[PDB]
Design an enzyme around this catalytic site. Structure first.
Site, PDB file in Angstrom:
ATOM      1  N   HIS A 132      48.266  61.429  22.361  1.00  0.00           N
ATOM      2  CA  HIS A 132      48.494  63.128  22.363  1.00  0.00           C
ATOM      3  C   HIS A 132      48.798  63.655  21.050  1.00  0.00           C
ATOM      4  O   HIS A 132      48.304  64.762  20.427  1.00  0.00           O
ATOM      5  CB  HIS A 132      49.191  63.829  23.617  1.00  0.00           C
ATOM      6  CG  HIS A 132      48.588  63.039  24.838  1.00  0.00           C
ATOM      7  ND1 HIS A 132      47.404  63.506  25.405  1.00  0.00           N
ATOM      8  CD2 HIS A 132      49.324  62.466  25.927  1.00  0.00           C
ATOM      9  CE1 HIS A 132      47.220  62.847  26.672  1.00  0.00           C
ATOM     10  NE2 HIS A 132      48.573  62.130  26.687  1.00  0.00           N
ATOM     11  N   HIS A 172      52.163  69.594  16.489  1.00  0.00           N
ATOM     12  CA  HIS A 172      50.616  70.058  17.089  1.00  0.00           C
ATOM     13  C   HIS A 172      50.205  70.399  15.701  1.00  0.00           C
ATOM     14  O   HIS A 172      50.566  71.064  14.921  1.00  0.00           O
ATOM     15  CB  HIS A 172      50.655  71.067  18.120  1.00  0.00           C
ATOM     16  CG  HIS A 172      51.600  70.703  19.165  1.00  0.00           C
ATOM     17  ND1 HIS A 172      51.073  70.304  20.303  1.00  0.00           N
ATOM     18  CD2 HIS A 172      52.924  71.009  19.567  1.00  0.00           C
ATOM     19  CE1 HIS A 172      52.025  70.077  21.301  1.00  0.00           C
ATOM     20  NE2 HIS A 172      53.248  70.632  20.713  1.00  0.00           N
ATOM     21  N   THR A 210      52.312  70.965  27.216  1.00  0.00           N
ATOM     22  CA  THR A 210      51.415  69.795  27.862  1.00  0.00           C
ATOM     23  C   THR A 210      51.656  69.635  29.137  1.00  0.00           C
ATOM     24  O   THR A 210      52.782  69.810  29.608  1.00  0.00           O
ATOM     25  CB  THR A 210      51.723  68.480  27.013  1.00  0.00           C
ATOM     26  OG1 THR A 210      53.147  68.153  27.012  1.00  0.00           O
ATOM     27  CG2 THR A 210      51.360  68.489  25.451  1.00  0.00           C
ATOM     28  N   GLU A 270      50.514  76.238  18.113  1.00  0.00           N
ATOM     29  CA  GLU A 270      50.596  76.569  19.642  1.00  0.00           C
ATOM     30  C   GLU A 270      50.781  78.158  19.649  1.00  0.00           C
ATOM     31  O   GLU A 270      50.312  79.057  19.984  1.00  0.00           O
ATOM     32  CB  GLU A 270      51.424  75.876  20.143  1.00  0.00           C
ATOM     33  CG  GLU A 270      50.835  74.443  20.214  1.00  0.00           C
ATOM     34  CD  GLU A 270      51.144  73.517  21.547  1.00  0.00           C
ATOM     35  OE1 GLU A 270      52.543  73.408  22.158  1.00  0.00           O
ATOM     36  OE2 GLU A 270      50.379  72.891  21.846  1.00  0.00           O
ATOM     37  N   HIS A 276      58.107  66.444  17.812  1.00  0.00           N
ATOM     38  CA  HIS A 276      56.458  66.065  17.639  1.00  0.00           C
ATOM     39  C   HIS A 276      56.082  67.322  17.184  1.00  0.00           C
ATOM     40  O   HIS A 276      56.650  68.147  16.923  1.00  0.00           O
ATOM     41  CB  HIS A 276      56.006  65.782  19.117  1.00  0.00           C
ATOM     42  CG  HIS A 276      56.112  66.913  20.017  1.00  0.00           C
ATOM     43  ND1 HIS A 276      57.028  67.227  20.785  1.00  0.00           N
ATOM     44  CD2 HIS A 276      55.194  68.004  20.250  1.00  0.00           C
ATOM     45  CE1 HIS A 276      56.963  68.226  21.542  1.00  0.00           C
ATOM     46  NE2 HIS A 276      55.823  68.814  21.089  1.00  0.00           N
TER      47      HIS A 276
HETATM   48  N1  5EF Z   1      54.993  71.016  23.439  1.00  0.00           N
HETATM   49  S1  5EF Z   1      56.067  70.453  24.377  1.00  0.00           S
HETATM   50  O1  5EF Z   1      57.585  70.478  23.630  1.00  0.00           O
HETATM   51  O2  5EF Z   1      56.115  71.385  25.491  1.00  0.00           O
HETATM   52  C1  5EF Z   1      55.759  68.653  24.741  1.00  0.00           C
HETATM   53  C2  5EF Z   1      54.793  68.011  24.106  1.00  0.00           C
HETATM   54  F1  5EF Z   1      53.739  68.535  23.519  1.00  0.00           F
HETATM   55  C3  5EF Z   1      54.308  66.731  24.386  1.00  0.00           C
HETATM   56  F2  5EF Z   1      53.425  66.085  23.707  1.00  0.00           F
HETATM   57  C4  5EF Z   1      55.433  66.150  24.971  1.00  0.00           C
HETATM   58  S2  5EF Z   1      54.934  64.282  25.473  1.00  0.00           S
HETATM   59  O3  5EF Z   1      56.036  63.718  26.203  1.00  0.00           O
HETATM   60  O4  5EF Z   1      54.625  63.824  24.255  1.00  0.00           O
HETATM   61  C5  5EF Z   1      53.523  64.340  26.640  1.00  0.00           C
HETATM   62  C6  5EF Z   1      53.645  64.780  28.078  1.00  0.00           C
HETATM   63  O5  5EF Z   1      53.897  66.260  28.114  1.00  0.00           O
HETATM   64  C7  5EF Z   1      56.458  66.784  25.610  1.00  0.00           C
HETATM   65  N2  5EF Z   1      57.438  65.957  26.414  1.00  0.00           N
HETATM   66  C8  5EF Z   1      57.471  66.278  27.845  1.00  0.00           C
HETATM   67  C9  5EF Z   1      56.871  65.762  29.106  1.00  0.00           C
HETATM   68  C10 5EF Z   1      57.692  66.006  30.250  1.00  0.00           C
HETATM   69  C11 5EF Z   1      59.137  66.143  29.646  1.00  0.00           C
HETATM   70  C12 5EF Z   1      60.380  66.075  30.366  1.00  0.00           C
HETATM   71  C13 5EF Z   1      61.629  66.365  29.441  1.00  0.00           C
HETATM   72  C14 5EF Z   1      61.388  66.796  28.255  1.00  0.00           C
HETATM   73  C15 5EF Z   1      60.218  66.575  27.347  1.00  0.00           C
HETATM   74  C16 5EF Z   1      59.065  66.522  28.389  1.00  0.00           C
HETATM   75  C17 5EF Z   1      56.545  68.037  25.434  1.00  0.00           C
HETATM   76  F3  5EF Z   1      57.734  68.507  25.970  1.00  0.00           F
HETATM   77 ZN    ZN Z   2      54.992  70.398  21.578  1.00  0.00          ZN
END
Ligand code: 5EF
Ligand code: ZN
Ligand code: 5EF
Length: 257
Positions: A61, A93, A196, A103, A91
């Site tokens: 992703h 985008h 996401t 975003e 991370h």
């Molecule tokens: N743009 S964002 O910051 O909303 C964002 C992401 F864009 C993204 F890609 C991820 S992930 O873990 O790589 C993919 C599954 O969501 C996360 N991680 C998430 C998934 C669930 C969770 C739980 C606690 C902290 C972070 C996340 C995320 F918070």
């Molecule tokens: Zn993000």
């Protein structure tokens, strides 16, 4: 699986994650003229001096750098937040071209990319549990524009060829996230969501006003990553952004002006 393509991208996510059509989804367009300056907001406190990066991975992703968040080492507080939030990962985008990839948007302007530093409220003990709470996470968002290089990004970009396809990871120690920040910590803030799946409505968003500059060569290395696993048809990891979602009954607050 969920993704960013025509058949599994953002317009499809609500089927497996109905909160996609919720009342506090992210990202949003930040209408700068409508954002309310809140002189009660505090300066953000970004305390990244003892950060311990651990690993970098391509999860199909995005790519993510994970931190040791087992003690208070890299923390965000102040600003709109009550309590202490620990950095767990960052991370990005980004787009296929420099005129899209962020975003959040600012008066409808799309930046080339957006960096998200994800933090969890230590009152909930772990990031998973925090993600189940309305005030569980704080994500610091930073826009990237293309121009001069960001020297603090170079260690990341130089490691990407080792994690080209989904599922690859590598050791990634001693990366200092202070090298990704702009000069100013002026920000907008609003209540929102993960961008996401699972799209949980657990995020206090803090979006910095000042973008960082990255070079064309740095972003072109992002665009050499693959969504796919090794072996599978090659699909470049580009346009891994969710578009702006309805603001609904929310106010965006500004820390400045
Ligand atoms: N743009 S964002 O910051 O909303 C964002 C992401 F864009 C993204 F890609 C991820 S992930 O873990 O790589 C993919 C599954 O969501 C996360 N991680 C998430 C998934 C669930 C969770 C739980 C606690 C902290 C972070 C996340 C995320 F918070
Ligand atoms: Zn993000
Ligand atoms: N991310 S990294 O570890 O690959 C890393 C860098 F490679 C890099 F070059 C810099 S710098 O400030 O551009 C270099 C000036 O000496 C930083 N900048 C830092 C770390 C400490 C600090 C404090 C304030 C502003 C920037 C930075 C950096 F964290």
């Amino acid at each position: 699986h969920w993704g960013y393509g025509k058949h599994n991208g953002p317009e499809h996510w609500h089927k497996d994650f109905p909160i996609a059509k919720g009342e506090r989804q992210s990202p949003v367009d930040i209408d700068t003229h409508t954002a309310k300056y809140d002189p009660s907001l505090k300066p953000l406190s970004v305390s990244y001096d003892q950060a311990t990066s651990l690993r970098i991975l391509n999860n199909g992703h995005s790519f993510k750098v994970e931190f040791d968040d087992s003690q208070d080492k890299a923390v965000l507080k102040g600003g709109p937040l009550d309590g202490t939030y620990r950095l767990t990962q960052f991370h990005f985008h980004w787009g296929s071209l420099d005129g899209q990839g962020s975003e959040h948007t600012v008066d409808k302007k799309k930046y080339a990319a957006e960096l998200h530093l994800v933090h969890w409220n230590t009152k909930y003990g772990d990031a998973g549990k925090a993600s189940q709470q309305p005030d569980g996470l704080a994500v610091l968002g930073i826009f990237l524009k293309v121009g001069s290089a960001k020297p603090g990004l170079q260690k990341v970009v130089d490691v990407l060829d080792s994690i080209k396809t989904k599922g690859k990871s590598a050791d990634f120690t001693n990366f200092d996230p202070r090298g990704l920040l702009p000069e100013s910590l002026d920000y907008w803030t609003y209540p929102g969501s993960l961008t996401t799946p699972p799209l949980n409505e657990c995020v206090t968003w803090i979006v910095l006003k000042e973008p960082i500059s990255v070079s064309s060569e740095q972003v072109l290395k992002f665009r050499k990553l693959n969504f796919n696993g090794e072996g599978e048809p090659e699909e470049l990891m580009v346009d891994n952004w969710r578009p702006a979602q309805p603001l609904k009954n929310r106010q965006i607050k500004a820390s400045f002006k």
